[PDB]
Amino acid sequence: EKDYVVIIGSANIDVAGYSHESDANPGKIKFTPGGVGRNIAQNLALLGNKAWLLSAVGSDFYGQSLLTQTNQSGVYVDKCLIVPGENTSSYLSLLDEMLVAINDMNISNAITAEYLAQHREFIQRAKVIVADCNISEEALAWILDNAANVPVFVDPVSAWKCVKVRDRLNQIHTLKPNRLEAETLSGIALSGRDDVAKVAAWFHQHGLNRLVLSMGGDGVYYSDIRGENGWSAPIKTNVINVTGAGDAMMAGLASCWVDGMPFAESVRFAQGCSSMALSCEYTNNPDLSIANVISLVENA
Amino acid sequence: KDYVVIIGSANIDVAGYSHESDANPGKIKFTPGGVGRNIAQNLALLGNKAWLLSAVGSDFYGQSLLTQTNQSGVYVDKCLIVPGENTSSYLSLLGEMLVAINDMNISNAITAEYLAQHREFIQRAKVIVADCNISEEALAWILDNAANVPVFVDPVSAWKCVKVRDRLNQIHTLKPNRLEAETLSGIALSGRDDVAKVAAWFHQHGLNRLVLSMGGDGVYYSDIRGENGWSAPIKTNVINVTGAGDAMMAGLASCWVDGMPFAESVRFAQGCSSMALSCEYTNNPDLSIANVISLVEN
Ligand SMILES: O=c1[nH]cc([C@@H]2O[C@H](CO)[C@@H](O)[C@H]2O)c(=O)[nH]1
Ligand SMILES: O=c1[nH]cc([C@@H]2O[C@H](CO)[C@@H](O)[C@H]2O)c(=O)[nH]1
C-alpha cells in the first residue's frame, strides 16, 4: 500500500546508568533509542504503519547508529537530517528511581521550517502527521500552516515544551496532554476529576478539535469539539517501565485514526498500547502489535 | 608490512555536564574510550599499523565505536562483536567529577580462546600492548604465547593492576602510576626517595623495564640492566587529564618499534602525554611524531 504517516520530532540516545553498591563505582549502563517523535514513529511501524521520521541527528557516528537501529524496527529514516559537526541529542539518567537527569537536545533546532519545506509535498501527502513539541515554535507553526488538511496529531512532550501549542489549538486535530500539561496550557487547575469538563471546554473554546487528556490513575478523559466526551478507566498493568507509555498511546491514537476507528474505541486501543509499553523493560515494546493490544484489551 | 597489536578494552565514554546546577539541561558527550582502544588510536596517529583485538556488543553503538576507531587509522577488523551483549561504557557526571559508573563486563569476552584464534597473527606483531581490563586468564595467555614479541602492559587501575604481580618476568615494559606501583610492590611511595627501592622490588621480581609516572614529580624509569633516571614533567596547560597515560603508553611502544633508546623513548612518551593533556578529547586528533618532536625540542 502507498499510504504512510509522517512523524516530525526528536530522536535521542537515552543513556541510563544504574549504580550498584551505591568516586567510580561499577554499575550498568544502557544505551537505547529515545526521543518522543522517534519513539512514536517506532511504535507506529510496529503497529504496521508505513512510518517516515523527519528528524535530526549529528555526525557523531552514534547518530548514524540511532538511525540504523530505528530503521531496523521498521521506520523509514532516509529523509532525516544528519547535521555536520553537531552531537546527536541525548537523555541521560542516573538511577539507583531516577536520581538525576540531563537533557541535551539543542540539535532539535536543526529541524527547521526550511528542512520541512524541502519535504513539503511529501508531508502534504501523508495520511496523518504527528508532531512533538521538542521542535521549535517556528517549525511547529510551519507544520500547522502547511498541513494542507492532513490531520496533525501533537504530542506536548512536557509542561515546559507544551506552551508553543497554546495559540494554535485551532490547527491541531488531536492533542494528548497529561494533567500538568493541560493545567499549564489552560491555566485551570486540575485538582480532581470534577475539573476536567471545564478544562476541556477551555480547550474547545480555543479551537481544539479533539482532546485526549491522560490523568494517570484517574484514567483518560477524551473530548471532541462536536460534543462526544467520556472517561476511559485505566488498564491495570504491572508497571515495569513508565518511559514510553505516552509515546505508545500517541502512536495508537494516530494508527487507529488512520485505520478508520471511532474516537472512543481509538482511545481504549491507545490505552492498550500504553499498557504494553508500561509492562516492558524498554522505552519501546518490540512485541507491540495490533494482535497483542487487541488481545490485551478484549481481555478486560 | 610491520604492525603492532593492541589487546584491551573498547568503551563508549559518556560525559554529562549538569549546566545550571530533576530534568536539567546540560551537555552530553559520547566519545571513544577504553585504555586499549585509546592506545591503538594513539599508535595509528603516531603512524603505526595498529590492530585492535577487543570486544564490543551488538548494540549498534558498538558497531559505530568500531567505525569511528577505524576512521582514526586503527585496523578494527579482528575485534569481536558479541551477540546479545552491550558495549562496555564509562559514564561520568561532571566542573570536577561528581559520580562515575563503570560498566565493563564485556571485557570478559576477550578470551584466551578468542586470542588463540589469532595466535600466529599476534606472534608476528613487532610489539604487543595489553591492558589490564582483560581477565587474568587472557593476560596469562598473551604472556605465555608472545613468542619473544615484547609485551608492553598498561596496568589501568590500582584494582586491575594486581593481575600482573606474579608475571612481571614475562612483561617487557610496565607503566604503573604511583598508586599502582605501591599496590603491586607493597612499598609506599611517600616521596621521591622511595622509587629506587620500589624499582629494585620490580626488578627482583623479574620486570625488564619500569616506566613509573609520579604525577608532578615526573617519570622515574628503570631498566633491569642498570640504567635508571628521572625525567621532569613537561610544563603543560592541562585541559583534560583523561587519555594522558594512554598517549604515554602509545609513545613508549611506538618509540620501541622505531628503534629508540629507553631514556629518549621516555621523554618522547612524555611529550605524547602532554599533547593529550592540553587537548579537549581522550585522544588528541593532532597527535603526531612531528608535533611531539616539536613539543619536546623545547
Ligand atoms: O525534552 C525532552 N525530554 C525527553 C525526551 C524523550 O522522551 C522519551 C520518553 O517519552 C525518552 O526517550 C526521551 O528521550 C524528549 O523527547 N524531549
Ligand atoms: O576500568 C576502567 N575504567 C576506565 C577505562 C577507560 O580509560 C580511558 C582513559 O584512560 C577512558 O576512556 C575509560 O573508558 C578503562 O579502560 N577501564
Handedness of CA A75, A81, A86, A90 (dihedral sign): negative
Taking the C-alpha atoms of residue B48 and residue A53, their distance in angstroms, rounded to an integer, is: 42
Handedness of CA B280, B282, B285, B287 (dihedral sign): positive
- Other C-beta atoms within 10 Å of B97: how many? 11
- Other C-beta atoms within 10 Å of A207: how many? 13
Interface contact A64-B61, CB threshold 8 A = no
Resolution, Å (one decimal)? 1.9
Query: Who contacts B115 (Cβ-Cβ below 8 Å, separation ≥6)?
Result: B7, B53, B122, B138, B141, B142, B145
Task: Name the residue with the closest Cα to ligand 1, atom 12.
Answer: A34
Angle at B21 between CA B18 and CA B27, to 5 degrees: 20
Taking the C-alpha atoms of residue B221 and residue B215, their distance in angstroms, rounded to an integer, is: 13
**A42, A70 Cβ separation under 8 angstroms:** yes
Taking the C-alpha atoms of residue A289 and residue B17, their distance in angstroms, rounded to an integer, is: 38
**A209, A153 Cβ separation under 8 angstroms:** no
- Other C-beta atoms within 10 Å of B20: how many? 6
Residue A51 corresponds to which amino acid?
A
Backbone angles phi, psi at A198, to 5 degrees: -65, -45
Interface contact A13-B29, CB threshold 8 A = no
Query: Who contacts B173 (Cβ-Cβ below 8 Å, separation ≥6)?
Result: B150, B152, B153, B208, B209, B210, B211, B252, B253, B256
Parse chain B into domains and list their residue ranges.
Answer: 4-297
Name the residue in chain B with its Cα closest to that of A89: B28
Q: Which CATH superfamily is domain A5-298 in?
A: Ribokinase (3.40.1190.20)
Pocket probe mutation, ligand 2, options B6, B11, B87, B89, max atoms within 8 Å of Cβ: B11
Name the residue in chain B with its Cα closest to that of A12: B28
Grid cell for residue A98? 531516577
Query: Who contacts A59 (Cβ-Cβ below 8 Å, separation ≥6)?
Result: A82, A83, A84, A85, A86
**A129, A150 Cβ separation under 8 angstroms:** yes
Among the partner residues B24, B30, B100, nearest to A102 by beta-carbon distance: B24
Residues with a CB atom less than 6 Å from ligand 2: B 9, 11, 13, 33-35, 38, 90, 102, 104, 133, 156-157, 160, 242-243, 245-246, 282
| Experimental method, per PDB record | X-ray
Grid cell for residue A91? 537523555
Beta-ladder partners of B31: B13
- How many contacts, defined by CB atoms under 8 Å, are there between A and B? 103
3-state secondary structure labels for all residues of B211-232: EEECHHHCEEEEECCCCEEEEC
Residues in chain A: 300
Interface contact A65-B63, CB threshold 8 A = yes
DSSP B33: E
Name the residue in chain B with its Cα closest to that of A103: B25
Given the candidates 2.60.40.420, 3.30.360.10, 3.30.300.160, 3.40.1190.20, the CATH classification of the domain at B4-297 is: 3.40.1190.20
| SS3 state at B110 | coil
